[PDB]
């Protein structure tokens, strides 16, 4: 099934856009920086303790 998805992909290869994209990219640099809020603390405090307590039992 994975080989099938490889199959018709390369076959149609040899027979929304990029220039719109980099306009959307470089516009976001000079006016889009955000600032952290109170809701950003409460999840990652609970989450990072799990990253120390149980990921060390794996990797």
């Amino acid at each position: 099934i994975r080989d099938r998805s490889i199959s018709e992909h390369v076959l149609r290869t040899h027979r929304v856009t990029i220039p719109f994209l980099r306009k959307y990219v470089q516009y976001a640099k000079e006016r889009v920086i955000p600032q952290l809020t109170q809701e950003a603390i409460n999840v990652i405090v609970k989450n990072y303790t799990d990253l120390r307590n149980d990921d060390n039992t794996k990797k």
């Binding site: 952290l36 950003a40 990652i44």
Partner: protein
């Protein structure tokens, strides 16, 4: 660490930091003192070095304790 990006200053209601320009001036004024020792503090250090010299040389191993105790240790302290 999360409070670092909330603001640009860490301590809160318990401590105020020392600015470095005023800090170094108090350092530099302290650099012109030259304290001199006494005789009672001479007595306290000698037997305390015998504390260090005795228990360092009872292991003589490659264990968690380090090998040798220099006289330069007393030169520092």
């Amino acid at each position: 660490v999360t409070y670092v990006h909330m603001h640009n200053k860490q301590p809160d209601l318990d401590f105020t930091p020392v600015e470095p320009s005023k800090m170094r001036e108090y350092i530099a004024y302290a650099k012109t003192k030259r304290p001199v020792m006494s005789e009672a503090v001479n007595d306290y250090v000698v037997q305390a070095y015998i504390r260090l010299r005795q228990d360092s040389k009872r292991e003589m191993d490659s264990k968690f304790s380090f090998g040798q105790a220099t006289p330069r240790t007393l030169l520092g302290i």
